[PDB]
């Protein structure tokens, strides 16, 4: 694996 | 007209607020019109990715 999978920048604050 | 200058009404009626930079995914990038060099010359861009 050798690398943590990257995350996208399009996350948002979903209301709970 | 001539050497006289005037107010930039079009820029002020267009930029009431700066548009927020948002990326485009492949799906919605497909039908977006092909970028034209005149639309990028002397403008401000940013890397959203």
CA distances from residue B37 to B40, B42, B45 in whole angstroms, order as listed: 5, 10, 13
**Whole-angstrom distance, CA of residue B42 vs CA of residue B33:** 20
C-alpha radius of gyration, chain A, whole number: 12
Experimental method: cryo-EM
| Sign of torsion over alpha carbons B1, B6, B11, B13 | negative
Choose among B28, B20, B26: nearest CA to B48.
B20
CA distances from residue B32 to A7, B1, B18, B40 in whole angstroms, order as listed: 25, 36, 21, 15
Contact A10 B49 (CB under 8 A): no
Nearest CA in chain A to B23: A10
Nearest CA in chain B to A8: B49
Question: A10 and chain B: CB distance < 8 Å anywhere?
Answer: yes
**Whole-angstrom distance, CA of residue A2 vs CA of residue B24:** 29
Can you give the resolution of this entry in Å?
A: 3.1
Q: Where are the alpha helices (DSSP H) in chain A?
A: none
**Whole-angstrom distance, CA of residue A11 vs CA of residue A14:** 9
């Amino acid at each position: 694996i050798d690398r943590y999978e990257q995350v996208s920048k399009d996350f948002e604050f979903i209301k709970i | 007209a001539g050497e006289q200058k005037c107010f930039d009404w079009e820029l002020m009626t267009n930029f009431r607020r700066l548009p927020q930079s948002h990326g485009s995914n492949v799906q919605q990038r497909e039908q977006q019109p092909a970028p034209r060099p005149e639309d990028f010359e002397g403008k401000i861009v940013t890397q959203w990715y």
